[PDB]
Amino acid sequence: MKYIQTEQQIEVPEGVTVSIKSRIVKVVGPRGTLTKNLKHIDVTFTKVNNQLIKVAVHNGGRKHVAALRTVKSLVDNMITGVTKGYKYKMRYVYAHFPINVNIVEKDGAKFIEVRNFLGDKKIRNVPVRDGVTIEFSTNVKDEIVLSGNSVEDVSQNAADLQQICRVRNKDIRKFLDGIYVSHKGFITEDL
Amino acid sequence: MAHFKEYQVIGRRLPTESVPEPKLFRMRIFASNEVIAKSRYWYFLQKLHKVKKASGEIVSINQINEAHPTKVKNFGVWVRYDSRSGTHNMYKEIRDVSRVAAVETLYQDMAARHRARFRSIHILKVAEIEKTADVKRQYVKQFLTKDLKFPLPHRVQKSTKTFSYKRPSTFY
Amino acid sequence: LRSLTTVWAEHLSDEVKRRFYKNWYKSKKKAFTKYSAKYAQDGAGIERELARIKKYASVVRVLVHTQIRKTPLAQKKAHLAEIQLNGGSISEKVDWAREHFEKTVAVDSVFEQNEMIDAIAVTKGHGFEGVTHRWGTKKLPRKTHRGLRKVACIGAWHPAHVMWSVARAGQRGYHSRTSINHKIYRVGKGDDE
Amino acid sequence: TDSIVKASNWRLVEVGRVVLIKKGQSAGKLAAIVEIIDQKKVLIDGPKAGVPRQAINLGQVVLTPLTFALPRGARTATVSKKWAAAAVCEKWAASSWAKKIAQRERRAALTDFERFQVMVLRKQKRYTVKKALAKA
Amino acid sequence: VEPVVVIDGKGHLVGRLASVVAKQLLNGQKIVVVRAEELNISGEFFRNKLKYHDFLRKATAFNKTRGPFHFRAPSRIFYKALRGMVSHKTARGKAALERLKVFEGIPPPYDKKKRVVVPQALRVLRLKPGRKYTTLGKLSTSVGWKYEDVVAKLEAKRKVSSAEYYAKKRAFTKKVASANATAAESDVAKQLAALGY
RNA sequence: UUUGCUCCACACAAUAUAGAUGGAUACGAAUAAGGCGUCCUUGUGGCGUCGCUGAACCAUAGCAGGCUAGCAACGGUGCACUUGGCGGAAAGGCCUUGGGUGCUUGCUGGCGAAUUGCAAUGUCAUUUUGCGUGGGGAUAAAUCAUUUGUAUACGACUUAGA
RNA sequence: GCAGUCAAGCGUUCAUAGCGACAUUGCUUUUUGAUUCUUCGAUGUCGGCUCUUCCUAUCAUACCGAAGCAGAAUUCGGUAA
RNA sequence: AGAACUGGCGAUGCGGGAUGAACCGAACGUAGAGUUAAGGUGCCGGAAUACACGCUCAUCAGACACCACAAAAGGUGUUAG
RNA sequence: GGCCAGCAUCAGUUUUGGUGGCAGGAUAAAUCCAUAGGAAUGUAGCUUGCCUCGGUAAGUAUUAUAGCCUGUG
Ligand SMILES: O[C@H]1[C@H]2c3cc4c(cc3CN3CCC(=C[C@@H]1O)[C@H]23)OCO4
Ligand SMILES: [Mg+2]
Ligand SMILES: [Mg+2]
Ligand SMILES: [Mg+2]
Ligand SMILES: [Mg+2]
Ligand SMILES: [Mg+2]
Ligand SMILES: [Mg+2]
Ligand SMILES: [Mg+2]
Ligand SMILES: [Mg+2]
Ligand SMILES: [Mg+2]
Ligand SMILES: [Mg+2]
Ligand SMILES: [Mg+2]
Ligand SMILES: [Mg+2]
Ligand SMILES: [Mg+2]
Ligand SMILES: [Mg+2]
Ligand SMILES: [Mg+2]
Ligand SMILES: [Mg+2]
Ligand SMILES: [Mg+2]
Ligand SMILES: [Mg+2]
Ligand SMILES: [Mg+2]
Ligand SMILES: [Mg+2]
Ligand SMILES: [Mg+2]
Ligand SMILES: [Mg+2]
Ligand SMILES: [Mg+2]
Ligand SMILES: [Mg+2]
Ligand SMILES: [Mg+2]
Ligand SMILES: [Mg+2]
Ligand SMILES: [Mg+2]
Ligand SMILES: [Mg+2]
Ligand SMILES: [Mg+2]
Ligand SMILES: [Mg+2]
Ligand SMILES: [Mg+2]
Ligand SMILES: [Mg+2]
Ligand SMILES: [Mg+2]
Ligand SMILES: [Mg+2]
Ligand SMILES: [Mg+2]
Ligand SMILES: [Mg+2]
Ligand SMILES: [Mg+2]
Ligand SMILES: [Mg+2]
Ligand SMILES: [Mg+2]
Ligand SMILES: [Mg+2]
Ligand SMILES: [Mg+2]
Ligand SMILES: [Mg+2]
Ligand SMILES: [Mg+2]
Ligand SMILES: [Mg+2]
Ligand SMILES: [Mg+2]
Ligand SMILES: [Mg+2]
Ligand SMILES: [Mg+2]
Fold first, then answer.
1. Which residues from the 83-122 window of protein chain C have CB within 7 angstroms of nucleic acid chain F?
2. Helix, strand or coil for residue C183?
3. Could you tell me if C35 and C11 are in contact, meaning their C-beta atoms sit under 8 angstroms apart?
4. Mutate to test the interface with E, among C58, C162, C164, C165 (most CBs of E within 10 A)
5. What compartments host this protein (chain D)?
């Protein structure tokens, strides 16, 4: 029916200033700064006060409105991302061949380099995205950890490592071999 | 069927020796002209009583004008309609400024949503929903909230010459 | 890509000069004889061209020609051609070019041993050629009326048109070919028993 | 480091938003939004300007930046009372819009001779401005 | 109106820009169109990409030369949209088309001349906000066009020089307004006001 | 081969014309956002203002625009010159300097205009070419035939010949 | 000839992994019929040889999902001519 | 393939349905001015890129009778009941 | 008076504007004015609870320091 207006809030925490012109969003806090283009979506932002920003859609349909919230979220995860920051955890899984995972660099690279997957002589590589940093967990067997300010960049880099270790021509129910995402969360602790 | 007027129509079974002064029935009828209105009258009447035009007489036809033509009003509307595969009762709510405007857009809506043309529709009742909160359909309720305001974003001005020397702007 | 100037060296061997003609012996050999004069005045006109090239010019090619007289062929008329110039920087490129005017360039300065090179050339000619050898169509049986180095069915009935995709008698050879991955087994040197 | 968030600052449809009607027997006339009917229709009224109380499409009206205090669904006499009291006409008149409207209506009532005088004047102005545009 | 009308293709919808360009010709109006690479088509990129390959398969079976020709360039995609709206097989049709010129970018003459627009084909006034649409340049580059990068390079160069021009100009026009103001309140000035100027 | 070619200049003569009749009047980018002015901490900054159409801006008066005088300005502008510079996407155009020169309706003057007869496009554009005149400048080639065979049915191709 | 819907059964157990009755909706025009519209002042009225091109309802090959896929092998399905 | 009544084509052009014996409109001496039919009015192409309220986004959308096809069965796409 | 035109006054046909007087109807319906009654998307005031000296909110409260609705004339 088109709703004459629906809207959402985006809270702002003590460390960060978010600043938005046209629909180009910049959020800047303790852990640095991300920016994200919202031009493709047609909402109206409004600052009410340094810890509060509203987003509204005037005279909109379902599919429209239904993107107002995902706008609210995308901009939140920038603000959380720039305060606490994100950390994705992945564990190796193999039933006979140890999965050897290193970090290598050609021409400034940074590549996740997986060897011996299900035996494979082939040497697998996933590029390290910028913003994201990899630390092989001490004190945890076969745990890789990707962390950074962009949820979207770590989550993706994560999913790229996991997918490089898909299994062919086997019952992928019996052959569970892989590198899987085993925990999603934050950098800064007590939270 | 066009731009409606509302008519009171009154008819009654041609008199007879043993029954002089038969009983007189009225219908309010939304039609675009009195000719269509008298037709519609006979149409529903042969749907209710044993008469047809042949053996009956229209007694009086009168246009009824809206009582408060510049009063905004919440209309509850009741309709019977035929679809391709069956027939269906139905209730809509319309907000406008006269029963005559309201029936214009109902016929518009029925046609646009259900592909119902005029022949295939029956007005059961149109009546003014007096107390708000007996308004039931949201797409109406929406327009009763206090201190209502809305922008009209992305303005498109109609160009009057083919060429323009600017690049427009939809500010508003 | 468009060509926007060609700068030429002051003196020009008869060998190339000869290329600019169809009847050398009768001709007044007047080619480039005004251009040559552009060097006279201090250098002015040639520089600004060179100069211009440097300012614009996304690529640079050098005008080289062969010393066919150093060759047992009869044909006297030398061969002239554009060679792209890949060493770095447009401005460095023309400096190189300008520098080598009337000077002479060697193969070893271009090719090394074991290097894979390509060969661009016009294929031998064979003239008007039947379908069977031009396309290596099947010989038709020995019993067949009016010839057998042919194609039996030159097309279905519809499209009621012989089609571009069927073998037909015609010219064979004298085609251009770009052939790749020929390996240099030797770079010989003339002055070298 | 505050936050800085744009604006986008639309004129709104709201009781007591004055609009300039654009089609019809009124047209060029101002008017006030009284009640609001749906997304596309409002009830307008413009007694000072002559325009009858009516229901109208928004499509035929253009929202001005002007607004005054009007109770939703207030009748014509009430509307005339507030309007005058809130002095909207002078307010409108003072605007560049209305002034620009007035301009071109004059331009289009000029006599041929008046037209001729306009040029003789522009010639006059041009002579002294062109000068000043050459001395600093 | 004017001897030549230069149209900034940018932000216009092909078949609407075409439909007006065609008529303009047939009525005697010379036209040039620029930045056809920045022209628009309703429908997401994939739809028009698929559409374009439909166009691609049509060809004279016995000889792909006699057959329909496929030009990949944005100007030329435009001209197709246009030619089809013109009885191009008649003298009168061949005539009108010759009053037309289409171009990727804005090459000389036309970059110092003013370009206009056609509101009844401007995308931002026509398309319902929300609907997906397509840029000619990206479409063409997908079907073979070889020159998107070069046009872009040359344009950014062009856009710089024109920013100087403008700035230089906005400077001068500030002075003018200043002068124009120290002449305000004078008699001649008040008289003109009276007459609508 | 009967003094031919070319560029500038004018002149006569033809031949045309998809259609002059004040001016194609240059940021870019966004459109759920911008332009312009101004300030400042130079920023996704403060403040002010505008839109709602180019219905604008510029130009526009004078025998299709004649001949003349003067004043106030020191401005505008046409033209041929000269100074410095920028433009290669198809630049072939833009900007700047300096004197010279015409015009100026910025204001004020003297003279003229009729009979084209009450309208008749009432002829003011620009295309291409041809012919003499004299101001700069320049003084080839291709083809046939012959010939080669890296080519070829014939043409064509590829060589060669003071 | 080819492809569906319902789902009683089949499949140790388990409708729908793979299948599928009684029914039922379709598509195709290399089957054969039905018709008799064109050709009877004539459209060479078997098959093979050759050779091009096209369709896809895909046998192989590329990459995939699924299985009553442990491996090997196979089967079902997608994008695919 | 064969009957019933009427209207047609055959024997007939003209406008419309791009095209077409039979549909729609309308039946014809030579012409001027007007007005219409059926059918149209973005451009081809005469004629509103008219007004107005809804609906629809299709990685094979849809687009006007005769007419140049689609069905059962399904969708947590969206609309109104 | 041969040819072709312009204007004027009219005639036939037609097309497109301005403007005057009347007739209907619920002797239009509204607006407006008068009067009675009402209610909330509740105007003044009031109470209460936070709250940077009043602003908010949630209560009463039917014209008050806005107004509207409904009938009758
Ligand atoms: O020409 C006739 C047919 C025909 C007649 C003959 C004959 C051969 C043919 C070939 N048929 C193909 C299609 C055809 C259509 C005609 O009926 C021809 O051999 C002796 O006569
Ligand atoms: Mg498998
Ligand atoms: Mg296996
Ligand atoms: Mg009533
Ligand atoms: Mg040059
Ligand atoms: Mg042989
Ligand atoms: Mg062979
Ligand atoms: Mg061989
Ligand atoms: Mg034999
Ligand atoms: Mg063969
Ligand atoms: Mg012509
Ligand atoms: Mg601003
Ligand atoms: Mg600024
Ligand atoms: Mg600012
Ligand atoms: Mg302007
Ligand atoms: Mg003069
Ligand atoms: Mg050009
Ligand atoms: Mg004078
Ligand atoms: Mg001469
Ligand atoms: Mg059953
Ligand atoms: Mg089971
Ligand atoms: Mg069982
Ligand atoms: Mg078969
Ligand atoms: Mg026969
Ligand atoms: Mg025959
Ligand atoms: Mg035959
Ligand atoms: Mg035969
Ligand atoms: Mg295909
Ligand atoms: Mg398939
Ligand atoms: Mg099982
Ligand atoms: Mg698949
Ligand atoms: Mg193939
Ligand atoms: Mg194919
Ligand atoms: Mg009939
Ligand atoms: Mg007969
Ligand atoms: Mg007939
Ligand atoms: Mg016809
Ligand atoms: Mg048809
Ligand atoms: Mg056409
Ligand atoms: Mg037309
Ligand atoms: Mg109209
Ligand atoms: Mg039907
Ligand atoms: Mg269905
Ligand atoms: Mg549904
Ligand atoms: Mg005459
Ligand atoms: Mg008359
Ligand atoms: Mg009248
Ligand atoms: Mg109030």
1. none
2. strand
3. no
4. C164
5. Cytoplasm
